Structures are given as C-alpha cells and as structure tokens.
C-alpha cells in the first residue's frame, strides 16, 4: 500500500497488482485526478537488441492502431528508457479468460457480441500486416461489456528468470505445429468460440501433449461439433477449424457470416 510511480511527469497512485508474466507486471492505478488506468511495467534490463526492437515495434503499432478501432485497448501514454517501459493503458473489469472460468454458461447474445468484437480487433491488425499468432482468451480485456485486444503478438516474451494454463497449445493451428498467414488467427479465434459454445477447447481432453499435437494435425481425427440450437454458430465453428488453411474461412468472410449479421 501507498506506492506511487511517475510516467512522463504525471504521478500515479498504485492500488494493486492485477497481473504479471515474463518480466512484466500490471498495476491498477489512479492519476492525480483520480481517473483509473492499468499500468503495464516491462523490465528491460536483461533484453537483447532484438527484444528491445520487438517492444518498440509493438508500442508503435499499438499507438497507431488504437485510432483505427475501439476494439483495441487504449494506450494513453508511455515512458520508455533502457531499464523499463511503463504503459498507461485503459482499465478493464476483468480479462476474458478469467471471466470464462467464472461462468458456467455464457449467454448466446453475450457470446455473439464478444465474437464480433474479436473479429473486428483481429481484422484491424491484419489490415496492417500483423498476424498475432498466439490468440487466447487472456489476450482480450472486458471493458464495460466490450472486448479489447490487449496485444499484437509482436513483442518477444522474455523468461521469468527471477524467484517469482501457461504456454498452452490448445489454440495452436496445424500449420504452426508442422513449422505466416492470417488464417492462423482464424483457427485460434475458432478455438475461443468453440470454448464459449461447448465449454472446452476442441482438443482439451487430450492430456498428453504429444498426442494432442498429433491430433491437431491428423486429418483423420474428426473434431466433434455437437448439434445446438444456433446452426449458424455450428457452421462458423466448422469453417474456422478446417485444418487446411487455404480451405479455412477468412476474417472478411466471418464478418459477413449470418451468425454475425442475421437479427435473431
Ligand atoms: C495477455 C497480454 C500480455 C502479454 C504480455 C505481457 C503481459 C503482462 C503480464 C500481458 N498482459 C497484459 O498486458 C495485461 N494483463 N492484464 C490482467 C491486463 C493487461 C493490460 C491492461 C489491463 C487493464 N485492466 C485489467 N483488469 C483486470 C484483469 C484481470 C483481473 N483479475 C485479477 C486476478 N484474477 C486472478 C484474474 C482476474 C483484474 C483486473 O482488474 C482489477 N487487466 C489488464
Ligand atoms: Cl477510436
């Protein structure tokens, strides 16, 4: 308690830590006017030039792309030095991953609204040549019912190093396993929707990771799509989770899909 920090001359009161990973921490904070933000702190002391560049590149894209869609998290300010980065970001209620863990059933409307938000954010980054390639529910922040994409997958994650469902392959596409395309983000989004529809990711039940990786790529391993009242949702899932990326549906196609367009 009673910690503060400064970012471009502005003093922020730290209320609590709300996340961490790699060599970074996220803080719920207040500025001088008692407006709430999240500050993301990245420790750069161990970073090589390649890693420093990947962080610079991500900050530049995030700062640019927030003006192109409200489904991308706001970045209000940042301070960047050799030792660290402080990013003053939009505050959210909770991330999507934690929310889905709390909820047994998701409301069909809620599920559809979240889907629309994700497609729009991801479509935005693709329009600027960015493939995320590691989309999971944790990459989305819920802000007053609206999803915001938190990151673009450009920054190279540094290792924990210090004393101090992680690195999961459940959202990984076939083409990523056999060793880059916007279709890769479609598979991952499809895995998120699949989770929101049937309460688990398509290959979740396979505990052995080698088996699971083989199941992702094996075209004889049929993915189950049990019947549900929303036949358009069932179709979206089937189209996202085609193993051949060339046969897989595109984001502009998903945006014109009756699941997102037809007023039910
Ligand atoms: C996944 C993206 C990523 C990639 C690399 C490095 C990092 C930093 C750890 C990240 N993570 C973040 O960049 C990040 N993580 N979180 C939690 C936030 C961010 C960015 C900004 C942000 C804004 N508002 C929130 N709110 C929030 C989220 C989760 C929670 N919790 C509390 C602990 N529970 C066990 C789970 C749920 C609480 C929150 O606010 C009170 N939360 C956040
Ligand atoms: Cl905007």
Swiss-Prot record:
Residues 12-260 form the Protein kinase domain. Keywords: Acetylation, ATP-binding, Kinase, Nucleotide-binding, Phosphoprotein, Serine/threonine-protein kinase, Transferase, Tyrosine-protein kinase. Present in rapidly proliferating cell lines. It comes from the Eukaryota. ATP binds at residues 18-26, 40. The active site is at residue 134. GO terms for molecular function: ATP binding; identical protein binding; kinetochore binding; protein serine kinase activity; protein serine/threonine kinase activity; protein serine/threonine/tyrosine kinase activity; protein tyrosine kinase activity. The keyword Cytoplasm does not apply. Signal peptide: none annotated. Changing residue 151 to A: Loss of kinase activity. One of its GO terms (cellular component) is spindle. One of its GO terms (biological process) is meiotic spindle assembly checkpoint signaling. Interacts with TPR; the interactions occurs in a microtubule-independent manner. Interacts with MAD1L1 and MAD2L1. Belongs to the protein kinase superfamily. Ser/Thr protein kinase family. Involved in mitotic spindle assembly checkpoint signaling, a process that delays anaphase until chromosomes are bioriented on the spindle, and in the repair of incorrect mitotic kinetochore-spindle microtubule attachments. Phosphorylates MAD1L1 to promote the mitotic spindle assembly checkpoint. Phosphorylates CDCA8/Borealin leading to enhanced AURKB activity at the kinetochore. Phosphorylates SKA3 at 'Ser-34' leading to dissociation of the SKA complex from microtubules and destabilization of microtubule-kinetochore attachments. Phosphorylates KNL1, KNTC1 and autophosphorylates. This is Dual specificity protein kinase TTK. It comes from Homo sapiens (Human).
